[PDB]
Design a binder for this molecule. Structure first.
Ligand code: EWR
Length: 257
């Protein structure tokens, strides 16, 4: 890798460590063994009563997840400035790339805090079990299990934060998002990031030279995961009278898929 490329990879990496609340190194430290375990209705309510000393438990959970989304949206917007060319793009194209990319990035990064038994929540202070989420009443029990299925395979790739930062940058740089005005410049931006991702993976993972095509397929998987998630969110929005959607997230979903 040329010093410029090698340096650009570090640039991306440092912006990822700087802007994102959680990262894989820290998550693994906490998960290695002290997070309060949410494994049933009793422990969920105990955990809630920590913050609010009426709505169904499923709906409370539905709204906590949204707060994590809003926060990650803000962090991703700042992260994106480190991508060579992004800040030089038309303002509307920036909005378009982030609108379509944020949820793909969200589910990619949530894998870092997930293992086969559950996931870290509430800024590392809670661990909610996979089985508890499966026990929620339909259709809320169908929200997270596809995310766990994705994460277990994604985590099997054994990426580190230096790979993931580039992967997330690559996600944001997809030149085939609908409504992009300056498609040609975005494709050049994408080609540059994917170029850095490709070379970095070869350097960082000599034991798996097929990691790059595996990750391209995970990008396609994430796109389908997001489409299906948005559909389930919409169904919960229309049915379920107590389920509200944060206005920033509504605008993300609006006219998306
Ligand atoms: C259903 C909405 O899905 C979102 C996308 C989305 C899906 C799962 C998610 O897992 C966040 C972690 N988690 C789960 C899995 C249950 C409860 C929490 C939790 C507990 C306490 C806190 S304290 C702030 C924060 C979160 C995060 C974002 C969207 O569409 O925006």
């Amino acid at each position: 890798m040329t010093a410029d490329l090698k340096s650009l990879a570090k640039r991306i990496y440092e912006a990822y460590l700087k802007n994102f609340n959680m990262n894989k190194v820290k998550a693994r430290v906490i998960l290695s063994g002290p997070p309060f375990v949410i494994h049933d209705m009793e422990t969920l309510c105990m955990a809630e009563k920590t913050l609010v000393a009426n709505k169904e438990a499923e709906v409370r959970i539905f709204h906590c997840c949204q707060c994590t989304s809003v926060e990650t949206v803000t962090e991703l917007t700042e992260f994106a400035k480190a991508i060579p060319g992004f800040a030089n793009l038309d303002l509307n194209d920036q909005v378009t790339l982030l609108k379509y990319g944020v949820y793909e990035a969200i589910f990619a990064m949530l894998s870092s805090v997930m293992n086969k038994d559950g996931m870290l929540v509430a800024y590392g202070n809670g661990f909610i079990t996979r089985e508890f989420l499966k026990s929620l009443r339909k259709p809320f029990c169908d929200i997270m299990e596809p995310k766990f299925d994705f994460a277990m395979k994604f985590n099997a790739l054994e990426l580190d934060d230096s790979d993931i930062s580039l992967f997330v940058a690559a996600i944001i740089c997809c030149g085939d998002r609908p409504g992009l005005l300056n498609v040609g410049h975005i494709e050049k931006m994408q080609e540059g990031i994917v170029h850095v991702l490709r070379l970095h993976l070869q350097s960082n993972h000599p034991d798996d030279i097929f990691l790059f095509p595996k990750l391209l397929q995970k990008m396609a998987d994430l796109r389908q995961l997001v489409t299906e998630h948005a559909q389930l969110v919409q169904i919960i929005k229309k049915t379920e009278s107590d389920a509200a959607l944060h206005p920033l997230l509504q605008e993300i979903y609006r006219d998306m898929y």
